[PDB]
Point group: D2
Chain length 125, copies 4
Amino acid sequence: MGRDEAGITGTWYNQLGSTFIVTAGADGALTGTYESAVGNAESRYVLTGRYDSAPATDGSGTALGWTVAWKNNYRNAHSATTWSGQYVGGAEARINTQWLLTSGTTEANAWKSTLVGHDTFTKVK
Amino acid sequence: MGRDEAGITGTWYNQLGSTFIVTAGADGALTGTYESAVGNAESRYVLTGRYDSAPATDGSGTALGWTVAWKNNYRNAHSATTWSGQYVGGAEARINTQWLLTSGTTEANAWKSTLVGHDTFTKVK
Amino acid sequence: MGRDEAGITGTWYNQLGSTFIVTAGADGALTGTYESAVGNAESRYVLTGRYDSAPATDGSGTALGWTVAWKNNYRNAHSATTWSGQYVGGAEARINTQWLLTSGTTEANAWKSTLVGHDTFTKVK
Amino acid sequence: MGRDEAGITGTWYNQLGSTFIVTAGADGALTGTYESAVGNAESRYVLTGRYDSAPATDGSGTALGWTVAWKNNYRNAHSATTWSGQYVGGAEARINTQWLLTSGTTEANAWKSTLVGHDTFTKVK
Ligand SMILES: CN(C)c1ccc2c3c(cccc13)C(=O)N(CCNC(=O)CCCC[C@@H]1SC[C@@H]3NC(=O)N[C@@H]31)C2=O
Ligand SMILES: CN(C)c1ccc2c3c(cccc13)C(=O)N(CCNC(=O)CCCC[C@@H]1SC[C@@H]3NC(=O)N[C@@H]31)C2=O
Ligand SMILES: CN(C)c1ccc2c3c(cccc13)C(=O)N(CCNC(=O)CCCC[C@@H]1SC[C@@H]3NC(=O)N[C@@H]31)C2=O
Ligand SMILES: CN(C)c1ccc2c3c(cccc13)C(=O)N(CCNC(=O)CCCC[C@@H]1SC[C@@H]3NC(=O)N[C@@H]31)C2=O
C-alpha cells in the first residue's frame, strides 16, 4: 500500500538499458519520465500511469501500467507505448511488463500499426 | 494538434457498452474516467494517459494510450489495463485500440497474468 | 467434435477481404491455405494449425490456432503470422482471432520484430 | 535454408522448463511435440507450424510459428496456444517467441479469452 508506493517509486532499468523514473502517489497515480535506449527516441519523455494502491498480501505482485507518447522537445515519433505488468518487491525487485507500441497510420496501414514486446525492469543496471 | 485535443476530448463508447470520458490537455496529457460494462468493475475508475499532441497531416491517425487501475471506492480487482491505439477523426470518429490487462499474481502464476484484447471506441452508442 | 470438424472445415473471410481455406482433421489438425488481401503477400500460402477436437457443450467456443509463413513461389516476406482464437458455430458462425506477425530481424531490431492485431472471420463476404 | 532446417530441428527448452521437440521440413513445415512444465498440461501434445525456409543472410533471425491444442489422451484444457517468433543460430542459439493462449469461452466471456506472454527457448536446460 504505502509499501507499494515506497517499492515502486524510484529509478528502474530494463534489459535494453532504458531508464524509467517514477513516483507512485498515495492515490494510485504513477508520474515520471522515460528514456529509451532504442528506437526513435531521445532524452526523456513524460509518462503517466496507475497502479493498484492496495494489492493482496498473499505474495501476489502489484498490477500497474503506464503510457509514454513519443513526443518531446527533440523528436516526434508519431507513436505511443503502454506497458502493462506487475511490480514484485524484495531483494531483487522487478517490474515485469508487456508493452504495445502503436504508430499513427493511414487507414490502409492500420492493420500493421501496433508492435508488441516485453520489458523486465530492475533497480540495478 | 488543437485539432486532436478537440477531437479526442469527450465521451467515447466501446462495442461492449463501456464508457470512456477523457480530456486531452494541450501538453499531451489524457485524464478522465472509465466505466466498464464487463468484468470485475463498478462505477468509474480514474484513467490517465498520453497522446501525440502533434500527429502528421497525411491523414494518419493520432497515437495514444491510457491506463486504468481497477481499484476505486467500491471494488479492488487487483489488476490494471492499458489501451494502446490511435484516434481517427471525421464524421465517424474512432479510437481503435488493443489492450493488455494484467492481474497481480504469485510468481508461480505470472505466466498467466496478462489478458490481451481489442476495443473500438466511437462517439455514439 | 465431428460437429467442430464440420463447422470449421471450409472457406472463411476476414474484415480485410483475406481468404482462409481450411480442413479440420478428426485428429485435431488444421491444414489449408491463406490468401492475404493486404501486406507483402501474393497468392496462397500454406497454413497448418490445431484445434480442440472436443470443446465443451455449454455453448463455449472451440479454441484453435494456425500459422502461415509468408513464403511461397512468388514472394518471401521473411515473416510468419500465428492466429489464436475460437470458432463459434451457428447461423452467423465466426472465428474470432488475435494474431502475432513476426519478422526476421537483426538482434538490434528484435524489440520491434512483432506486430499484433485482430481478425474476425466469417463464412460470407 | 538447409541451414535453418538443421538449426531448428531438435529439442528446445524454455525458461519455465517446458520441452519443445521439432522437425523442420525442407518445405517450411514444423512438426513435433510440446510438453509444458506449467498449467493444465500433461505429457506431450502435438504441434505443427511453419518457418521461413529461406531467411535473409544479413544476420537476421528466421521467422516461424507453431500451435498446440491442449488436448491429448490425458487432458483436455479447452485451449490452444500459438507461438510467434524467430530462430537465431550460433553457439547460444535461441528461439525468441511471444505467445497467445486462447480458451474456448461463452460469448459473454470472450473479451477475457486470450492470455499473452513470452517464451525464450534454448538448446540447453
Ligand atoms: C506501419 N509501419 C510499416 C510502421 C512504420 C513506422 C513505424 C511503425 C511502428 C509500429 C508499427 C508499424 C510501423 C512504430 O511504432 N513506429 C514508431 C516508433 N517509435 C519509437 O521508436 C519510439 C521509441 C519506442 C521504444 C520501444 S517502447 C518498447 C521498448 N522498450 C524500451 O525501453 N524501448 C522500446 C514507426 O515509426
Ligand atoms: C492467473 N489467473 C488464473 C487469473 C485469475 C484472475 C484474474 C486474471 C486476470 C488476468 C489473467 C489471469 C487471471 C485478470 O485480469 N483478473 C482481473 C480482472 N479485472 C477486471 O475484470 C476489471 C475489469 C476489466 C475490463 C476489461 S479491460 C478491457 C476490456 N474493455 C472494457 O471496456 N472492459 C474489458 C482476474 O481476476
Ligand atoms: C523491424 N521493422 C522496422 C520492420 C520492418 C519490416 C517488417 C516488419 C514486420 C514486423 C515488425 C517490424 C518490421 C513485418 O511483419 N514485416 C513482414 C510483413 N509481412 C507481410 O506483409 C505478410 C502479410 C501479413 C498480412 C497480415 S497477417 C495479419 C493480418 N490479417 C490478414 O489477413 N492480413 C494481415 C516487415 O516487412
Ligand atoms: C475466461 N477466464 C476467466 C478463463 C478461465 C479459464 C481459462 C482461461 C484461459 C485464458 C483466458 C481466460 C481464462 C486459458 O487459457 N485456460 C486454459 C489453460 N490451458 C493450459 O493451462 C494449457 C497449458 C498452457 C501452458 C502455457 S502455453 C504458454 C506458456 N509457455 C509454456 O511452455 N507454458 C505456458 C483456462 O483454463
